[PDB]
């Protein structure tokens, strides 16, 4: 109340095959866009001068409206188990029956959904489902 | 027919190199600037061909072949309109025989106010300083 | 770089060339590199003009003087708040070859200052670079091979303006010549003073003395005239007219 | 070999863009001299 510090009190608690399906969005919709951009302006480092303050997020930032982020297209047919969801803050936080509740803690998805998440998920998921791929090359034989 | 046409041209260039101030001052006298200050000019080289071992030999040569391209852009008419109007008062001040300082004078105007327009300039001097010297000498 | 209309990129590759080849502020920066890295440049430095050797200006080596002393000048005057001030006039640079008398004098009018700061500077380096632009009008055999100056302050500039042209010597001189006097020539200072923007003009300054005396003789004639113009030029005129 | 989902050469499914689915010279040399510069 002295206006020392101010700490963000709260865990970035996320859905694993959720935040891996968002995550290989934005890397799908990033590697389009550096295909597409004829330019790519870099921004430049520090953004703001040594001699001016720190802005007044209420007078300059607050009363801005947002630019869209980096979303994906989805399709309204094939994608249609996530497409009204998967760009949340915390996607499912209020279906009741997918999610434990709002303190955000468990998850229980269905067949459909699970498919869609693991379809999306295909540049950063794992595919190696053959065990003997790792002969020679795992934990306890780099151990040796 | 070329070489006839070569004949004819030959016709016409023997008929006179004495310019004439107001033709200098106007527009439309383009051709005829072009044309008399060629002809002048090969009169010029034409004496020093007459005079060729008494006066600097070795740079007559290639004196005619940086005037190549001046001649040929004069008897084109392809001059840009400051640099024959001032060939032609360099010219003009050449043809009198007190007027010799005033010549070099006007070169100066001429070539201080690309290598093919330097090569032909020079060569203008060139000309300038081998009319002063048979002058001098007669 | 950026958006070019007609006739732009010619005029901006020139202005670049020169002013990379002559800027004087490059100048100081590449003579710092130089003091830094200690690094020299070999060459064969030709002698000093004196009265032990000054007869050797008329032989068939072509020669050129050159003078910077007027090419900055001014007038006096005294000012509302009782303070003394100067005001810009019209100058010249003197170029003179000794042995047949003719004599380029390059106007400098007060339209070239354009009100800069630290115009002593400006002077030295223009006239280098009318003396090099005089020097490339003139074809190979009527270009000097060397340049004497009368004030070692033009050597620099003037080596850097001179570097398109590898033969040509630049000389200092012992010999404190009176060419600055030039301006007291009636004549010459009339021509200098009525002109409304730059020009050269030509003269011979030995006025047809060689058909009668030797260069030497004309040059002893012209250094003694100059001479007294500039010890007591009311005196000096005063005897020649 | 070709991407299966989107049907182009090279390029494995893992690294796709597209996303998942289910004479004057000679009149004037005449006055003087032969022919080349
Ligand atoms: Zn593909």
Redesign the interface.
């Known amino acids: 109340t002295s206006g020392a510090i101010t700490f963000v009190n709260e865990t970035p608690r996320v859905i694993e095959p959720v935040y891996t399906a968002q995550w290989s969005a934005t890397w799908i919709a990033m590697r389009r866009e550096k295909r597409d951009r004829t330019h790519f302006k870099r921004m430049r480092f520090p953004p703001f001068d040594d001699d001016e303050p720190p802005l007044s997020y209420e007078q300059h930032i607050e009363n801005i409206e947002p630019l869209d982020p980096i979303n994906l297209p989805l399709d309204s047919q094939d994608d249609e188990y996530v497409k009204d969801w998967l760009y949340d803050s915390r996607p499912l936080e209020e279906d009741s029956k997918k999610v434990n509740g709002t303190s955000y803690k468990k998850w229980s998805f269905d067949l459909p959904e699970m498919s869609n998440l693991y379809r999306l998920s295909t540049p950063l998921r794992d595919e190696v489902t053959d065990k003997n791929y790792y002969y020679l090359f795992d934990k306890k034989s780099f151990f040796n | 027919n ?1 070489p006839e ?2 004949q004819e ?1 030959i016709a016409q260039d023997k008929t006179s190199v004495i310019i004439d101030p107001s033709q200098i001052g106007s527009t439309e006298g383009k051709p005829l600037l072009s044309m008399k200050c060629n002809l002048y000019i ?1 009169e010029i080289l034409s004496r020093w061909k007459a005079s060729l071992e008494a006066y ?1 030999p070795e ?1 007559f040569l290639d004196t ?2 940086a005037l ?1 391209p001046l ?2 852009q004069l ?2 008419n392809q001059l840009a309109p400051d640099l024959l109007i001032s060939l032609a008062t360099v010219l003009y001040h050449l043809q009198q025989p007190k007027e010799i ?1 005033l010549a ?2 006007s ?3 001429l ?2 106010g690309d290598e093919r327009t330097r090569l032909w ?3 203008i ?2 000309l300038i ?1 081998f009319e002063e010297w048979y002058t001098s000498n007669h | 770089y950026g958006n070019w209309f007609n006739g732009l990129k010619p005029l901006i590759q020139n202005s670049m060339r020169t002013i990379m080849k002559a800027n004087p502020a490059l100048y100081v920066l590449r003579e710092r590199i130089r003091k830094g890295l200690q690094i020299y440049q070999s060459s064969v430095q030709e002698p000093f003009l004196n009265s032990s050797n000054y007869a050797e200006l008329f032989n068939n080596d072509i020669k050129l003087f050159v003078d910077d002393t007027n090419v900055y000048r001014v007038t006096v005057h005294k000012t509302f708040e009782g303070n003394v001030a100067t005001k810009a006039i019209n100058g010249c640079i003197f170029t003179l070859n000794p042995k047949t008398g003719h004599l380029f004098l390059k106007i400098i009018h007060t339209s070239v200052w354009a009100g800069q700061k630290r115009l002593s500077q400006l002077a030295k380096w223009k006239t280098a670079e009318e003396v090099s632009a005089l020097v490339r009008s003139l074809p190979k055999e009527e270009q000097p091979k060397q340049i004497i100056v009368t004030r070692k302050a033009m050597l620099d500039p003037l080596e850097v303006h001179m570097l398109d042209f590898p033969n040509i010597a630049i000389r200092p001189t012992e010999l404190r010549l009176p060419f600055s006097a030039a301006m007291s020539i009636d004549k010459l200072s009339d021509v200098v003073m009525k002109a409304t923007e730059p020009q050269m003009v030509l003269f011979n300054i030995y006025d047809d003395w060689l058909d009668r005396i030797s260069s030497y003789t004309a040059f002893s004639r012209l250094t003694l005239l100059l001479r007294a113009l500039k010890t007591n030029e009311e005196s000096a005129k005063m005897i020649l007219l | 070999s070709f991407c299966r989902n989107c049907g182009e050469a090279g390029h494995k499914e893992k690294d796709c863009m597209e996303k998942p689915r289910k004479i004057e010279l000679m009149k004037l040399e005449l006055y003087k001299d032969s022919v080349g510069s």
Do not use: E, G
Request: proline share 0%; aromatic share 8%.
């Open positions: 070329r046409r070569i041209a090969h600097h740079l005619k072949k190549f001649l040929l008897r084109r300082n070099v004078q070169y100066m105007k070539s201080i300039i020079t060569s001097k060139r300083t």
